């Protein structure tokens, strides 16, 4: 297929270029923002991301910084003003990245340590009291499937609102309220990124800390 | 003639009168958390902020209903 | 958005986030651990020197 | 800091005196964080040391048995 | 012509105005649990967290109604 | 043409806006039982758990209405 | 064609949005009776149990409306 | 064709969503009378029982509406 | 054919969902007057009985609406 | 045929579900004024009676809507 | 035939169920202002009367909606 | 015939039952601000007046909906 | 004929009764924040004002629904 | 009639960038006093205090 080239190339170039740029900052230094960004991000993320403990090591800061910096390009492009050629990558990559990252992170993080015995044999007291097999399927399917609806609804609503507000605000007549309405896009993108990163880190740490 | 009434009535009825519970719950939670957090400063550091986590459930309340609006337009 | 979007959007974000975080975890962890190592070394050296 | 005079009276003579500001003491319902500008609220003080700033930044833990706010 | 009005009216009427009870109950439980949990330190994490288990009942309240929405679309 | 509108309107109207009382009552009972149960230690687990038995009545309130939904589909 | 819309609309409108008052009253009475019954020991089992008798009136409230549902099906 | 829609819609709309005020008032009066009657001993059985007389007014409130249901069936 | 739908819809819509405010207000006034009248002895019978006079206004609230029901039957 | 449905629907919809706010406000004002007026002796008859003047506003609230009912009958 | 249903439905729907918020707010403001104004002597007539100015906003709330009723009759 | 039902139903449905939230919020904010502002002298005019700024948001709530009424008449 | 009823009913139903949650939450948050901020001045500087940030969520609640009104007019 | 984007973009970008950068430059620029003052004051105070 020759179509869908500007969305995949523009999204993969901006996402891979801004996400695959941490390899050159290993030796230093670099300026006055290295101590404030590294100390504030490491101290605020490590001190505020309570619930990991025995979860992982570099997956918290690497998944949080890589997911926030890599996923921030889909919602930080609201300032670019100017037809279905560069907007499907945000809605498709947002729901696909949130659902695939939440399901793959929860299943891979929960099926690594402990484990196969708790997930492969979740009956006994959890499905025998309660002798009917409906509580494990309803509670397990709803609790295990709530991340796809929450991440797909938050990421889909944030990407749809940012792309719809950017396209409608950049493709209009006058340039007053549409060109000056940056508070809803900036507050919605910052609140969506902070709420998605805090909800994903807190949900992964809380869901991974107990079985 | 059922596409206009079905799509418009489905999008307006499915994404219309539904934000009253989320908007009322946000104001009630903000007022209760503001009164409880204002009545005690020591409790305004690692307790009342946890109530903000309840806002994370709003996306699973009426805000998810808007996700069905595309079914009456895009789908 | 008609076709050929799930493979590019899913493989781009999944391969970029996983390939970027897996290959950038030691650089961001070792490069970002200077604040905790320097703060712990200075606080432990000052507290151990004052207590000693 | 110092603002309002939060003098403490014991059963015999005076227990404590001097001004006070951000007095983070526990009330009748539980742990609270009062400071300078609170309204009149008569509570009860039970047992337990409460770290409250006295004068010129004197965060002292005043521990007593009974108390009437 | 009854499939568009029946499916759209069933999905919008069955998955429309229903999140007011769950969104209002989440805000009321979050505000009451935040005030009661913040008013006492020892009660900050010993019983108030059990109130979060009440959120597990939300999946059996309005959130289960969305499970019927497929009956107006996929089924 | 009355089977689609009657079954869809009966399933959506009979299993639609009805979980507001159960979801609101679960949050109100969880917040009141959490505040009253957390305000006292001896009252943390002696009678407050009996309030959870009230949740057993929810199955006889709105949750029973879903039992009639099959009458608009299977029956 | 009036039997499907009349029976379905009568069963859905007569046995639909009606359990909000009973489900809300059960949660409010359970939370108030749990807080008032747990706030005092002697009041834990002497008069608070009489509040459970109020639940006996629920059968004469919305639960009786379900008794009319047969009129839209069996009768 | 107006007898089935008028009788079914009249009985369902006249004997449907109406028990919310009676069921909510019974639970609110039972919880308030249980908390106020249980908070004091002398107030346990001296005037609080008079609140039960208020329940006698319920028969003249929503319960009287059911008396009109026969007008949509027997009359 | 407009006499059955107009008379039945007028009597059911005019004398149907309207007793929620009177039934809820009677229970709220009975519970508040019972708790406030039972919390003090001197206030048990000196001014609290005047609150019963408020019940006399109920006849001018929803109970008066039933007076219009004859307009959909006798008139 | 529009006179019966227009007059009946206008009188029932214009003078139907509207007394819930007035009946609820009368019971809430009577309970709050009864508790606040009975909690203190000097406040039994000095300013609490002024709350009864608020009842005079009820004639300008839902009670005025009945004044439009003649427009669906006499006019 | 659209003038009778459009004017009657516009006047009844535009001037019908709308006084619940104004009548409920008048009773809630009268009860809260009566309890707070009667609980203290100095607060009996110094700022509580300013709450009556809030009643002036009622004319810009539901009472203004009646101003549109002429559009369904005189205009 | 769609202009009368569309314009009348759009103006009545868009500018009808919507002032209950603004009228209820004005009375609740006036009663709470009057009780809290009258309970203390120093708090009578220092921050309580800022609550009046919340009334400025009413123009962005239901009062803005009236701005759409011209779309069902002038536009 | 479905464009006028679908567009007018979609804009009125999608931008009509929806401001009750935002207007009620703004008044409840303003009253609770005004009472809590008025009872303690030390907390009226960097705590209760944070509740105003909750108003920023209103634009993502009912106020966002108005953003869909153009879909029933401009789109 | 027209667009007028230089006034809104220049006024909003210069006002938000100058106000946010100038008012927020103390939190991002003054954050080095903890590591710099803790490492310099910790090493100098620990070496001089331990030596004396």
Residue numbers in the entry:
A (entry chain K): 46 to 127, 140 to 268
B (entry chain P), E (entry chain Q), F (entry chain R), G (entry chain S), H (entry chain T), I (entry chain U), ...: 3 to 77
C (entry chain I), N (entry chain J): 2 to 53
D (entry chain H): 1 to 69
How is this structure described in the published paper?
In most cells, the bulk of ATP, the principal source of cellular energy, is synthesized by ATP synthase. Like the analogous complexes in other kingdoms, it is based on two reversible motors, termed F1 and Fo, connected by central and peripheral stalks. In vivo, subunit ε is believed to change conformation in an ATP-dependent manner to prevent rotation of the complex thereby conserving ATP when its concentration is low.
Three different conformations of the complex were identified using 3D classification in RELION. (A–B) Cryo-EM maps shown as surface representation, states 1, 2 and 3, respectively, resulting from rotation of the central stalk by 120°. Three of the four classes containing 104,510 (State 1), 67,829 (State 2) and 53,587 (State 3) particles were movie-refined and post-processed in RELION producing maps at 7.4, 7.8, 8.5 Å, respectively. Once a complete model was built of the highest resolution map, this was docked and refined to the other two maps to create three models. In all three rotational states of the E. coli F-ATPase, the εCTD had an extended conformation, albeit with a different proportion of particles observed at each state (46%, 30% and 24%), suggesting State one to be the lowest energy. While the overall density of the c-ring was relatively weak, 10 peaks of density were clearly present when viewed from above, confirming the stoichiometry of the c-ring to be decameric in E. coli F-ATPase. Interpolation between States 1, 3 and 2 to simulate ATP synthesis by E. coli F-ATPase.
